[PDB]
Design a protein around this nucleic acid. Structure first.
Ligand SMILES: [Mg+2]
Ligand SMILES: [Zn+2]
Ligand SMILES: [Zn+2]
Lengths: 303, 581, 76, 463, 61, 142
RNA sequence: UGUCAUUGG
DNA sequence: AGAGTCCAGCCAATGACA
DNA sequence: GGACTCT
């Protein structure tokens, strides 16, 4: 099969697995192609169907070699589709797209390589072919977070700049200003059984990409653990705090909840708990996190 | 004058009627043609029987006359209307306002010695939308001009949080429909109300709309802050029960929270949440849900059958304890003890703790709780198809004894009463079987969620479970079965003059088995009859409601505690006590 | 309904002293005509008559008349 | 026949309001309509739905539902919906509106930011709520009818006819994703609006890592006696186990509108499907798969809930009652010419009618100043109006002097009193004067009253 | 136009769309590699809507 | 529309003026309903007829048919029902659009009009009524 | 500016 | 005893038409 | 369709 569903199962401490799962779902953000511009649409589908379907192209199968630079937002990408009706092969697959990486260090837009298994995909099926009337579609979709200005329109040498400027000024008021993203795969952990529900493709090694994702996650999680501090004194109910006059920790954070639940507490979000904060060892939690990431990579190596 | 007949512009009738008057005002003209012109200008129904002529009587003609439409009711500025949704970050004293409403609606800030610095600061930062100059008596929309702020003038800016908006649901059947609570900024395009006020307004979140009005007059601001605040309206003004409370899921959450046992301190504090700050574990290490309820009440009050030193001495906490407008409400007792603020605080804190119980433990009813296997339903099916054939054979034996002549026949009323009693006995047998099944299921599976919401007191009883699992009963139209049409029958599925009681509307099947065609006919007959009856009765209830409201609305309590209207003493003491009801 | 010497319905005003604007707001098309024929002079004390002339009704906070004592302001 | 009667009446009423594949000429007909974007055929159907081709012109989507309580937010028919489900085109619709303006040719050849040099609106442009679709200037003083919706809409088609009068027909389109307050339903009349758009990381999940797209409350399923919804979820899940027959062809599951096959036959069919999928299961796992019960896990603490949850797929329908089609707000605007109160419509930006029962509610609250300020005309619309105490009509200012014309013609000089009444009150009084009824107001020359000090009164009891 | 991912779980179903609609395999041979029931329902129930050709030009005077 | 009936008759019914409508022909419009919806036209069929008024006097073996007035023909525009696959009853040769079921009429303002069935007022059984007690009514129609 | 049709709570 | 007269819930929303 | 009033 060109795509196989697989599962990576690591048995950990329950609060450590919950911490890794929530840090994955909060930190590992793969951007979507929400910035979509239709340049010419004479097909039978409206622009909104095209943009909603192009918004969720599985672009991790194409831009995998730059995964880390896409995960640190130092690099965007781009798809471009210009496809008309045909006599034979009268349909649009994912091979008809042109995929470009956008180095934000230079605004350098350069074409990435395209797998030949993407010919065995399907996005659209055209109607009955007539050379009398035109049935074509052209669109360009940028990844989320890319700022569209004349610096990047100067690099779009594969399309009409006039049509792009006009259609972008048409569609600019509707594009979501927030960063729209995707988690790369399903990560759960029921009762400390941390599970990754991944998709492995035939044309690249999933272990290198998974190692890049887990290394990014481990670095970001250790930085977030180090820059995490719990307020002392009295409490207003917005952040997690600790009152030493009563000896009561107010948990209103996920990281605080998972850290103190590693040390034998049974906390929930927005709850007070009699917990002595001299038991929290940050270095032991970081060492358990590092051993857990080594266990995750060892479990993925036997995929 | 022309003010009652202005120039109509879209791209007058009275002016044309006066022109037809003045077209006959000549010296060589009869008084009959001038009289007809005057009459059809004033009142066409004196000489005719046509409506839709715009005459003078059009301002006093029926429901759409001038006073009823434009004097006791009007369309207003500073209004809004939107679909509603629930909110858990909104208490019963608050309301969530969408961003388009608070980006359109404005509030007044008056110019005086107290607020002149705030008005000057808001004018310097371009946050002022309107400015009213009272001395020149003119309003100016601010889209730099010159504005001098004198006392009596005001500015109008965007509406801020904790401003009292008057919002409501329609139809406004009683005064708990239209209340005044505080604006909170929420998300979406829906007016987010609390679920605790929902039963007060007869509201669901299935597409109901609610309206808002902003009345920024200082007397109206004080009256909205005091008199129309939901803390002021906590107790019902006739029977005293609380107007706010808990709804469907929080009832079963209250029941299961009372029944919970042997909790840790961390589990109790997880259930309590933000109200676990002042929770006192005395010397205990294991706790129960009765300790959680003792902490939630927080008063050492007694009540016969409910409380003793703060502990609940009832066996279970059911829907009479926490749902609005019930006679055993704990919030009603806590507000009978101190004040409406304590009852409103118990309602807010109780709803928070019940929803945290639902977040930790969950509640769901599956199909396996209703029908786990086919044993009981097969048993009741065999029981029903035995007993109804016994009924049919007994009735046929009576009919044949009449037909051959061994006995004299009964009247048709008495014969219908005898068959009515036999079918009612079969229905009661089904009810007793359903009750025994409920007892046996809760002693076999004591954690059945359907029987849990039956014991908590929410919408599940043995009759509804008989409709699902047992029988559907006899379908009544106008108190009797369906009347016989052509050929002495109702449907052509039965013989002419058929004595079959199942063909007159007795349904043997249930919803689990599925109704057959004739049974579906009689069920749809009852359903469509109920729909037609409520549609026909809605307008009549509205007309009588308006008549009674207009008759009784001028009857008030005077300064001496007596109930008067006009200058007539109706009652010597209001509510027989000279105390609020 | 039994405030007079006879039971009176909710549809009509027979014995109770109701003003012309109260009868017109209740729904009676010949109310002002019968008031003009009989030359009626009625005081404005009811809700239907207070809402016509933009007066505060005698309900609740409007049940009382409010004055201001300018003595303490003129004293200083 | 497995539910109660009123639910079938409501379901027949709501099936005609469900968004479907409305027309093949979606980009061709300039007409009002709502179209479903990524349609799915229903699988648990009757043959009459197949032969009328309603199932081919699909009227909903298969979603994953959970029958549980999600933190007390699911109350009174509110549903929880997944944000990631909505982002991926889940139950996504397109509303197409038709606008038709009729312009004089001299007005067309004579707020305009979306217009081209042709005097018409630009294709694929998004119209905001003050935008005109064509040039219409009458002698300047433009009188063009303008876009008045709360949302933007993309100009899909423009059709122009040049005659004695220019006829411009614009078809605009807007993609509507589910937001808070949007109405949804099942094929069992289980309807309600969106109460909360939850992230997929704050939703309960099963062992396979699947979060539900929709969470419906479970109490309303058993209080309204909608038994066939549970059978529909069971049969939909049994199709997802085995969607093909023994020939391999896609066959649907025949569950008719009025069904005469028992529930045990459907349980046996579901058992055969699940035993074809996985050739050996434990009988607890098989009974959990047939009855669609699943252990779900709290996403915050990663711990299971107390009991198993009814969890499975169902054909779910979107209804045509959107929040921004009903959303109304007015600060200030036009007034009607006769009575000088606010105008009516929603396209015209009118006011909400504070009716008579709301007036009853504010009377019953005891708030007399509030209902006085509501029912009277605005403080901005104030003017000094004088009435004659003798004849009862409005005095006139001739050249600065307040006079009564009727009394100066009758050789009088009566009192003129300033009044603060509504404009509709004066129009009513002038029309009753036109009928012949003279209305004369009398004023209170109250005797000047004096505050005297009062004795001390203590109302506390004596024990 | 088809969705390339499942709208419930987010899994890629593009290759199965090509294997089912264009290569015209059976549902058994396509759903041999699909395990979640939501993605199986997407591959068994989703269609493209029957639509006519767009009348051109879109701006007609 | 095919009518041949005497309108008036004089001189002891041997002189009569007869109207005569014939040559009734109905033709479909020269476009599809989608072009009628886009362009703004109305999907109406055009029927034309020839109507002749003439006086007709009977002799012993002669019939004096003297033409008074004649009118040969578009006369009436009838709304045309869009059927299954956008196929009207008049266009016998047209390609079936594979999704439309039709059943609507296109108005003069490109508005689609759809119709319900209506119960007739004429009753096939006679109607029974009780006006006042021991007084009954039996109303039927023909 | 009003009628008619359809729909919602 | 029989005709005249007035009365029939509230608040909406779209579209077509004069 | 139905209740009150004058005839
Ligand atoms: Mg509702
Ligand atoms: Zn005068
Ligand atoms: Zn899926």
């Amino acid at each position: 099969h060109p795509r196989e569903e697989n599962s990576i199962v690591v048995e950990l401490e329950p609060s450590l697995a919950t911490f890794i799962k929530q840090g994955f779902n909060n930190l590992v953000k793969w951007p979507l192609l929400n910035i979509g511009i239709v340049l010419s649409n004479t097909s039978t589908a409206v622009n909104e169907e095209w943009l909603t379907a192009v918004e969720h192209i599985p672009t991790m199968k194409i831009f995998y070699k730059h995964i880390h630079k896409i995960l640190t937002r130092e690099m965007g990408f781009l798809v471009y589709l210009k496809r008309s009706q045909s006599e034979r092969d009268n349909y649009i697959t994912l091979y008809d797209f042109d995929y470009y990486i956008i180095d934000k260090d230079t605004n350098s837009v350069t074409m990435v390589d395209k797998p030949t298994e993407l010919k065995e995909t399907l996005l659209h099926v055209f109607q009955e072919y007539r050379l009398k009337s035109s049935q074509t579609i052209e669109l360009i979709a940028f990844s989320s977070g890319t700022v569209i200005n004349e610096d990047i329109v100067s690099k779009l040498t594969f399309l009409d700049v006039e049509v792009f400027n006009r259609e972008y000024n048409n569609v600019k008021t509707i594009i979501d200003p927030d960063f729209v993203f995707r988690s790369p795969f399903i990560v759960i952990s029921p009762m400390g059984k941390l599970t990754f529900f991944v998709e492995v493709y035939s044309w690249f090694d999933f272990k290198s990409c998974f190692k890049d994702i887990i290394d990014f996650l481990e670095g970001a999680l250790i930085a977030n653990i180090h820059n995490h501090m719990i307020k002392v004194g009295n409490c207003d109910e917005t952040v997690s705090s600790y009152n030493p006059e009563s000896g009561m920790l107010f948990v209103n954070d996920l990281m605080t909840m998972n850290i103190v639940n590693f040390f034998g507490c049974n906390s929930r979000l927005e709850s007070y708990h009699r917990f002595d904060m001299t038991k929290v060892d940050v270095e032991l939690f970081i060492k358990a996190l590092s051993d857990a990431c080594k266990k995750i990579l060892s479990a993925s190596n036997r995929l | 004058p022309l003010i009652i007949r202005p120039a109509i512009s879209f791209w007058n009738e009275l002016t044309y009627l006066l022109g037809m008057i003045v077209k006959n005002c000549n010296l060589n003209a009869d008084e009959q043609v001038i009289q007809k012109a005057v009459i059809e200008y004033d009142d066409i129904k004196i000489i005719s029987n046509n409506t839709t002529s715009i005459n003078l009587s059009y301002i006093t003609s029926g429901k759409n006359n001038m006073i009823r439409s434009y004097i006791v009711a009007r369309r207003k500025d500073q209004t809004a209307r939107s679909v509603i949704g629930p909110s858990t970050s909104i208490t019963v004293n608050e309301v969530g306002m969408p961003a388009y409403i608070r980006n359109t609606l404005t509030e007044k800030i008056f110019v005086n010695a107290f607020t002149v610095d705030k008005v000057k600061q808001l004018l310097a930062s371009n946050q002022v939308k309107f400015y009213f100059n009272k001395r020149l008596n003119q309003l100016t929309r601010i889209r730099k001009n010159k504005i001098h702020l004198l006392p009596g003038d005001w500015v109008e800016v965007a509406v801020q949080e904790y401003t009292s908006i008057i919002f409501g649901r329609q139809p406004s059947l009683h005064r708990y429909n239209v209340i005044a609570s505080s604006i909170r900024a929420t998300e979406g395009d829906t007016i987010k109300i609390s679920p605790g006020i929902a039963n007060s307004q007869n509201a669901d979140f299935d597409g109901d709309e609610e309206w808002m009005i902003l009345e920024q007059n200082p007397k109206a601001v004080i009256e909205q802050s005091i008199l129309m605040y939901p803390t002021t309206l906590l107790k019902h003004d006739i029977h005293g029960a609380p107007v706010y409370g808990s709804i469907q899921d929080e009832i079963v959450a209250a029941y299961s929270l009372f029944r919970i046992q042997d909790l840790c301190l961390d589990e109790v504090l997880n259930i309590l949440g933000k109200y676990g700050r002042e929770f006192d574990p005395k010397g205990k290490c294991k706790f129960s849900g009765k300790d959680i309820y003792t902490y939630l009440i927080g008063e050492k009050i007694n009540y016969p059958g409910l409380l003793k030193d703060g502990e609940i001495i009832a066996n279970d906490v059911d829907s009479n304890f926490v749902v609005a407008m019930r006679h055993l409400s704990l919030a009603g007792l806590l507000s009978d003890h101190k004040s409406n603020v304590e009852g409103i605080n118990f309602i807010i804190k109780s709803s928070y703790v019940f929803k945290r119980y639902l977040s930790i433990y969950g509640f769901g009813v599956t199909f396996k709780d209703l029908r786990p296997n086919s044993t009981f339903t097969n048993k009741l099916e065999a029981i029903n198809v035995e007993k109804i054939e016994l009924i049919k054979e007994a009735y046929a034996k009576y009919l044949n004894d009449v037909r051959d002549g061994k006995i004299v026949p009964l009247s048709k009323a008495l014969e219908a009463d005898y068959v009515e009693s036999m079918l009612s006995n079969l229905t009661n047998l089904n009810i007793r079987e359903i009750e025994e099944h409920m007892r046996q299921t809760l002693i076999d599976d004591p954690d059945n969620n359907l029987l849990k919401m039956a014991k908590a007191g929410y919408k599940v009883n043995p009759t509804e479970l008989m409709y699902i699992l047992g029988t559907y009963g006899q379908q009544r139209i106008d108190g009797e079965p369906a009347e016989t049409r052509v050929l002495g029958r109702v449907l052509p599925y039965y013989l002419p003059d058929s004595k079959d009681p199942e063909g007159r509307g007795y349904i043997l099947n249930s919803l689990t088995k599925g109704l057959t065609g004739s049974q579906y006919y009689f069920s749809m007959l009852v359903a469509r009859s109920q729909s037609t009856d409520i549609v026909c009765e809605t307008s009549r209830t509205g007309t009588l409601a308006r008549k009674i409201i207009k008759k009784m609305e001028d009857m008030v309590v005077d300064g001496y505690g007596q109930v008067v209207i006009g200058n007539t003493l109706i009652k010597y003491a209001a509510n027989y006590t000279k105390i609020l009801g | 309904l039994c405030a007079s010497y006879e039971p009176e319905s909710v549809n009509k005003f027979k014995f109770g002293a109701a003003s012309t604007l109260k009868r017109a707001t209740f729904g009676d098309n010949k109310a002002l005509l019968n008031a003009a024929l009989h030359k009626k002079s009625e005081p404005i004390n009811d809700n239907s008559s207070c809402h016509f002339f933009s007066k505060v009704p005698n309900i609740g906070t409007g049940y009382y008349k409010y004055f201001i004592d300018l003595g303490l302001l003129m004293r200083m | 026949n497995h539910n109660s009667g009123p639910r079938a009446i409501l379901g027949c009423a709501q099936a005609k309001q469900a968004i479907s594949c409305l027309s093949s000429d979606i980009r061709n007909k300039i007409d009002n309509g709502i179209h479903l974007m990524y349609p799915e055929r229903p699988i648990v159907i009757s043959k009459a739905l197949e032969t009328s081709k309603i199932a081919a012109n699909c009227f909903g989507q298969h979603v994953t539902i959970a029958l549980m309580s999600y933190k007390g937010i699911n109350q009174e028919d509110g549903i929880i919906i997944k944000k990631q489900f909505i982002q991926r085109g889940g139950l996504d619709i397109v509303t197409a509106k038709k606008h038709q303006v009729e312009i004089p040719l001299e007005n067309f050849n004579n707020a305009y930011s979306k217009l081209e040099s042709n005097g018409l609106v630009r294709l694929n442009a998004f119209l905001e709520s003050g935008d005109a679709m064509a040039r219409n200037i009458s002698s300047s003083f433009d009188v063009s009818e303008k876009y008045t919706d709360m949302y933007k809409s993309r100009v899909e088609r423009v059709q122009v006819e040049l005659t004695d009068k220019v006829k411009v027909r614009v078809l605009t389109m807007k993609e509507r994703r589910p937001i808070l307050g949007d109405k949804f339903t099942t094929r069992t009349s289980q309807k309600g609006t969106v109460a909360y758009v939850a992230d997929e990381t704050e939703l309960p999940y099963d062992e396979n890592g699947i979060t539900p797209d929709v969470i419906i409350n479970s109490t309303s399923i058993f209080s309204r006696k909608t038994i066939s919804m549970l059978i529909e979820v069971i049969l939909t899940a049994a199709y997802s186990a085995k969607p093909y027959n023994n020939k391999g062809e896609n066959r649907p599951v025949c569950f008719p509108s009025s069904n005469e096959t028992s529930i045990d036959t459907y349980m046996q069919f579901a058992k055969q499907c699940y035993e074809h999928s996985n050739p050996k299961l434990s009988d607890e796992e098989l009974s959990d798969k047939i009855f669609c019960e699943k252990i779900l896990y709290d996403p915050e603490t990663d711990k299971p809930y107390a009991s198993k949850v009814f969890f499975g797929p169902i054909y779910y329908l979107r209804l045509r009652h959107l929040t921004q089609d009903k959303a109304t707000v007015r600060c200030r605007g036009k007034k009607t010419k006769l009575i000088r109160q606010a105008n009516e419509g929603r396209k015209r930006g009118g006011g909400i009618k504070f009716g008579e029962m709301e007036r009853d509610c504010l009377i019953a609250h005891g708030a007399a100043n509030t209902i006085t300020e509501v029912l009277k005309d605005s403080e901005e619309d104030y003017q000094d109006v004088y009435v004659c105490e003798n004849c009862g009509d409005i005095a006139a200012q001739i050249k600065g002097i307040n006079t009564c014309l009727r009394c100066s013609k009758l050789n009088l000089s009566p009192l003129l009193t300033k009044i603060d009444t509504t404009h509709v009150s004066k129009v009513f009084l002038t029309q009753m004067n036109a009928r012949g009824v003279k209305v004369k107001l009398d004023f209170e020359r109250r005797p000047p009253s004096f505050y005297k000090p009062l004795d001390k009164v203590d109302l506390k009891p004596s024990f | 136009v088809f969705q390339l991912v499942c709208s419930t779980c987010g899994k890629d179903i593009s290759h199965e769309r090509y294997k089912l609609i264009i290569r015209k395999k059976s549902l058994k041979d396509v759903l041999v590699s699909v395990k979640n029931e939501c993605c199986r329902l997407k591959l068994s129930t989703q269609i493209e809507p029957q639509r006519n050709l767009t009348v051109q030009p879109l701006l007609d005077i | 529309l095919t009518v041949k009936r005497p309108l008036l008759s004089f001189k002891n019914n041997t002189e009569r003026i007869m109207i005569e409508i014939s040559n009734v022909k109905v033709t479909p419009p020269d476009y599809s309903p989608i072009i009628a919806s886009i362009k703004g036209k109305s999907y109406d069929a055009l029927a034309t007829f020839t109507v002749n008024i003439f006086k007709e006097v009977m002799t012993k073996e002669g019939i004096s048919i003297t033409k008074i007035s004649s009118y040969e023909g578009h006369l009436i525009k009838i709304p045309l029902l869009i059927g299954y696959g956008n196929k009207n009853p008049l266009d016998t040769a047209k390609y079936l659009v594979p999704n439309v079921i039709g059943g609507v009429f296109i108005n003069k303002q490109s508005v689609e009009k759809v119709g319900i069935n209506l119960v007739e007022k004429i009753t096939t059984w006679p109607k029974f009524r009780v006006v006042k007690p021991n007084s009954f009514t039996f109303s039927f129609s023909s």
